[PDB]
């Protein structure tokens, strides 16, 4: 009943330890990159399969 | 994360945080209006018919998907008002996630998860991978390219089929070699699933119908966790799956769940992954991080950015929490790696977000969804950043009553389930 909150505070502890190294965002300075030329994408980029819910419901 | 901008779909483009964009990867599609809600994160309030040309139609497929719940409607998300409500809904959910330490940490990890600069044929040259950028059209007609980590987009044909995908490299396996790649999440804040609480194994006529509604915030967090794994290139090979026997549907006898999924669920389901396998994975990715640090140590030049070589090497030193000695050489610290790996795969899990949000949710993937509901979380009388559906100081605050579609019925419209499956 109140065990949940105890677990929450516990997890918060571990996050606090990582906060000193993972607490702030990076690559924040104002750099730019060269424009990416849009070439004829006849067979440009492919796709890395995602995760469909519980996945395959085999018959 | 926190969205410090008051975005309205009709807001004029400015080529900065509101613009028509193109994903160089996805052929030469039509430019779509997008909104940058946070550094490295964009939102495209359109049905996804861009990432995969194969999925251009929005009508039910010839062969119905064999899943517990599905929903189709080719007209959803076609008007400016819907797109405006979608943008506001997705924004509100990001804020709800941002309302707890767990969520704030996950979002920061995601913003820090910049895809590695390893697209050069010259092993000693750092170069961007075009698949991890988008082209932002300017009001003057010109455009500029920009790197980003995450894009939230509307669903494809099956409205409730939410997933996290990305563009691949012709040879490299970016989501599993530690490199990472820009993630595209198909999601919708306008619908949610219905489920029943686990059977008491005693006196309970299965003739129910998914009375409780899943909190949209958990569903989004779920996809963001996948994005996290994929941005750091530590996603488990989809070839690794767990076979499960099921008696839940007629003509079906089993279920296949990827280890990636089990890891992302956390709690009980994650325990289905063996200890030997778990250590195997941790060691595997640890080696991948070492290869990256090695690549960074051999980098002599960089092409394609106004930034210096030292700065760009430092971005990744920070991303992978690498150690740098007095001579400027990078190395993977075993202790640091374990803590980072542990946070990304064991702390960031669906089960832990359920605990932080204090909501009712399925306990295992074996408890299948049974219904789909239309919802509207934008109005504060319906849903709030801090409490979701279970509004404080009301009848909805106790026993997850806000998620009980029979008690809090003004918040839901039961929709037709297009499933071909028949529950046994
Ligand atoms: Cl609110
Ligand atoms: Zn998943």
Largest interface: A-B, 44 and 79 residues
| CATH C-level name of chain B | Alpha Beta
The name CATH uses for the topology of chain A is: Single alpha-helices involved in coiled-coils or other helix-helix interfaces
Largest sheet of chain B: 8 strands, mixed
Q: What is the level-2 CATH architecture name of chain A?
A: Up-down Bundle
Q: Bound small molecules, which ones?
A: chloride ion, zinc ion
Look at the helices and sheets of chain B and give the structural class. alpha+beta
- How much helix is in the residues of chain A? 25-40%
Taken from the alpha-carbon principal axes, the silhouette of chain A is: flat
Strand content of chain B: 15-25%
Rg of chain B computed from alpha carbons, rounded to a whole number of angstroms: 22 Å
Number of strands of chain B: 18
Strand content of chain A: 5-15%
PDB class: toxin
Keywords: botox, botulism, exosites
Assembly: dimeric
Entry title: Crystal structure of NEUROTOXIN BONT/A complexed with Synaptosomal-associated protein 25
What does this protein structure show overall?
The complex is a heterodimer of chains A (59) and B (424). Chain A has 59 residues and is mostly helical. Chain A has one helix and one strand, in the order αβ. In chain B, the strands form five sheets. In chain B, strands 6-5-1-2-3-7-9-8 form an eight-stranded mixed sheet, with helices on one face. Chain B has a four-stranded antiparallel sheet with strand order 11-10-17-18, with no helix packed on it. In chain B, strand 2 and strand 3 (41-47) form a beta hairpin. Chain B has one domain: Zincin-like, CATH 3.90.1240.10. Chain B is globular and about 70 Å long. Chain B has helices spanning 80-98, 101-112, 216-231, 259-265, 275-298, 309-319, 334-347, 350-357; strands at 18-22, 32-38, 41-47, 125-126, 133-137, 143-147, 150-154, 163-168, 183-186, 191-195, 212-213, 241-245, 254-258, 301-302, 323-324, 330-331, 371-374, 413-414. The interface between A and B is large, with 44 and 79 residues. Strand 1 (46-48) of chain A pairs antiparallel with strand 8 (163-168) of chain B, so a sheet runs across the interface. Bound molecules: chloride ion and zinc ion. Zinc ion binds at residues 222, 226, 261, 264 of chain B.
